[PDB]
Ligand binder design. Structure first.
Ligand SMILES: *CC(=O)N1CCN(S(=O)(=O)c2ccccc2F)CC1
Ligand SMILES: *CC(=O)N1CCN(S(=O)(=O)c2ccccc2F)CC1
Lengths: 304, 304
């Protein structure tokens, strides 16, 4: 029993983190096989960051200008290319600790673990979600760029995020490992405002299921609703619309608890309309939306 | 910027987790050097757990009855002893992945990372605190016993917790790595009620400092207070008394923000008396008490 905001074990990713230096800029790189992936803004002077022309800036860079250090050992860079907003640095040594891995581009509402690093060294691990506005709410200081987000399926690490920048509002933007930003963001020090940070409804419902499973049941009511009725209330409260696809995904939690998805919707409707009245659910005073239905099943069943 | 509930990178501890089986009971063990540490209740039938006499139960156990598996390789047990509520299984092979380590007994209010494991395999990592009632609020299913809590100082893992049991109220009790329970708890399936779970005041104040550092400042007020006045309010709200030792510990956060500790106390006093009024601090609707002042400094400064 008990339900915690839980990250994947980070060891498989720790073994992949390196330091990348170009000129006076140091940030983190991901070493998989004989390639080191890092944010392309490693080539910029903070002056360059105002309006950088990356292709033009890159012309002035040779293999030997990219200093890649794995622990206290230097890797030999034998090639470099830009793919979207990442650099791929080819090194002469395959990372001996390369896990089984995939690059995935996640959807908004999907959760992942971040291994926050500075100078290629791990400082911490925490759980995030891709927000519906394609930001993440992370913990990233100068030097953390190139830190990665991931999921693990048993022995296979799916890398989904690389950290690139902080918006003026202190929320975070980054890329998949093909260098494509989540959302409309660009690696430039310019006016970039996030859109509405809506609540991930399907994740809230998953977490309400988790609460019931773990004995927190006070919010279960006598009501049901319909997707359309629920969705009118969702809209009003800046919650994402609930689809039949979301209902289908919640089916196993429905099955386990015997609470129909639409009944749990009606409970969530009353919590939105009535608030918590000073009560808590799984030690939270607000409705948590950074657990997926898969997260709840995984944690509640003990998958390794 | 941004402030997250952050665990230590888990890799150094992942390399230490093994499976221990005695009869039909499987749980986790910690392999450091040529010793495997696990809960002594591994020797019990769930029948035994009602009123176990561990010394008597242990007489019936030989080295060869303790099945220790590290990945898919069996370790040879050449000795076993009971120390308090843990077994030490001597194996013929030093764990080649043994990190630098210490065993520490932490105080209430101190935070640590848990690597939740099943069958010696890591499932997740999350941040806990030793509650003032010597429970922890974890996430532990059957099979998770022998999972450990730890802190890392650069390269040295301080092990502070081993998971042993769930109270009827779904909170958790365990031992240090010398097998001594935190609090009054015993490894027996009996009536064990937790005392008052008080709020860790010094940690709340640390987290209020973290909020200011990260731009969440709405709760800063025009008031100050004294330790004695604050403490009258703390008592009323089931907050731990604040000592000058706590004020001293918060000094660096005071220095960095320019907010005197007693001023921040007066802010916390008004939040206790007035509530949050539907507002949030660092994305929380309640006052978070599972960050230590050291945690806030570490995360805000980017220690690896
Ligand atoms: C994103 C990231 O982690 N980095 C880019 C900025 N650099 S830096 O130019 O060295 C720097 C250092 C300190 C303050 C601002 C700043 F831009 C660090 C790596
Ligand atoms: C604490 C812990 O993780 N364990 C002790 C209980 N055993 S068990 O006896 O195998 C068991 C299994 C399933 C349900 C209850 C139960 F006690 C597992 C390890």
């Amino acid at each position: 029993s008990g339900f915690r905001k839980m990250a994947f074990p980070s060891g498989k990713v720790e073994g992949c983190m390196v330091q990348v230096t170009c000129g006076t800029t140091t940030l983190n790189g991901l070493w998989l096989d004989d390639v080191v992936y890092c944010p392309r803004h490693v080539i910029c002077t903070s002056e360059d960051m105002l309006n950088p022309n990356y292709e033009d800036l890159l012309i002035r860079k040779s293999n030997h200008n990219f200093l890649v250090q794995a622990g206290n050992v230097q890797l030999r860079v034998i090639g470099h290319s830009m793919q979207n907003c990442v650099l791929k640095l080819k090194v002469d040594t395959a990372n001996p600790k390369t896990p089984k891995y995939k690059f995935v581009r996640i959807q908004p509402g999907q959760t992942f673990s971040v291994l926050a690093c500075y100078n290629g060294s791990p400082s911490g691990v925490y759980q995030c979600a891709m927000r519906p506005n394609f930001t993440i709410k992370g913990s990233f200081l100068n030097g953390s760029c190139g830190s990665v987000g991931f999921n693990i399926d048993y022995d296979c690490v799916s890398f989904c995020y690389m950290h690139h920048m902080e918006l003026p509002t202190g929320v975070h933007a980054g890329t998949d490992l093909e260098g494509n930003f989540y959302g409309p963001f660009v690696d430039r020090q310019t006016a970039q405002a996030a859109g509405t940070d809506t609540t991930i409804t399907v994740n809230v419902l998953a977490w309400l299921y988790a609460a019931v499973i773990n004995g927190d049941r006070w919010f279960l009511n006598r009501f049901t609703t319909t997707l359309n009725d629920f969705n009118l209330v969702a809209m009003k409260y800046n919650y994402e619309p609930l689809t039949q696809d979301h209902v289908d995904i919640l089916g196993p939690l429905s099955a386990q608890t015997g609470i129909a998805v639409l009944d749990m919707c009606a409970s969530l409707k009353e919590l939105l309309q009535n608030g918590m009245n000073g009560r808590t659910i799984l030690g939270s005073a607000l409705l948590e939306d950074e657990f997926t239905p898969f997260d709840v099943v995984r944690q509640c069943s003990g998958v390794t």
